[PDB]
Design a binder for this molecule. Sequence first.
Ligand code: MG7
Ligand code: MG7
Ligand code: ZN
Ligand code: ZN
Lengths: 157, 157
Amino acid sequence: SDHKFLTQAVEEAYKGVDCGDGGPFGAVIVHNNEVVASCHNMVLKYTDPTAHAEVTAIREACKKLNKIELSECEIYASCEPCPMCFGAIHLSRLKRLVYGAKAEAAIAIGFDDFIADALRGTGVYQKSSLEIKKADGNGAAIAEQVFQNTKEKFRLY
Amino acid sequence: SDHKFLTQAVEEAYKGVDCGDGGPFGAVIVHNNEVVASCHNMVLKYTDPTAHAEVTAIREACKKLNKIELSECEIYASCEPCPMCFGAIHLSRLKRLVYGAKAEAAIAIGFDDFIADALRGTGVYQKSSLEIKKADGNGAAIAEQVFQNTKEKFRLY
Ligand SMILES: C[n+]1cn([C@@H]2O[C@H](CO)[C@@H](O)[C@H]2O)c2nc(N)[nH]c(=O)c21
Ligand SMILES: C[n+]1cn([C@@H]2O[C@H](CO)[C@@H](O)[C@H]2O)c2nc(N)[nH]c(=O)c21
Ligand SMILES: [Zn+2]
Ligand SMILES: [Zn+2]
């Protein structure tokens, strides 16, 4: 099921790039095995630099469930969440994060070197408690491939 | 000019907590002495845990100016921005941050112990070169007192 929902987050990344909504990033939020939100980056569509895939998914999930905490939910991110997104995941109280590509994969095609210490376990003032899984094998291959496949199919930001 | 806009952010904090929109946090975004957005925390009003004051102000300012970078703007935060908000400030390309109260003043009334390494210069992966000013003297004292003053008017969320 991890592979199914991570692959859906990657699909979201491709769709968002395809329609010009934003960059190649997707996020899926699930309650057990029911998708509560499925989103991609909306920075260009919304004229909103906070509208990353993960933030968008968190907003949509909180609306869908009518509350500001998602402690029964897990999030799948096609790419390692940035410091803004990882902070949002902390505030939302999501209980588990599974992510596909390491941040360096996005850096390699032109995005900011902008990495969350709290996710990598090097934070001093910010310490995470949630369970974090970096995908391997086929999930990692798919997630990494996103950046080579979508290179110069969108406008960087 | 710094004292005027910091005071505006503090007044936003009181206004938001008084009408129930969210916690006692305010933020004002300015473009060469013209206010672009003046906002407070809307987590409760919006059912959105990402709707901190700073994030809300960035959303509003970017939509107003029809662009996703605010590189000619500065942001005044009644309180030291959290990891999520500092990440949003970084992504938005705001050129300067002035903040009133240290994060410990909010933590002292029960908010999350949740502090941005990149703001305090304590990260391995996340750096900032953003121009950052912690206010001092008069407006700093006032900003610090926001939390003791509003402790009773809202319930931690
Ligand atoms: C819109 N966007 C930009 N980056 C950028 O990817 C790099 C590595 O994380 C960082 O530069 C971050 O800002 C995003 N990252 C994720 N995980 N999701 C997004 O929507 C996103
Ligand atoms: C809704 N909210 C919660 N915190 C809390 O602030 C602490 C760190 O400063 C953290 O405990 C965080 O949860 C907020 N902080 C600011 N600056 N602005 C907000 O709108 C906000
Ligand atoms: Zn992000
Ligand atoms: Zn914040």
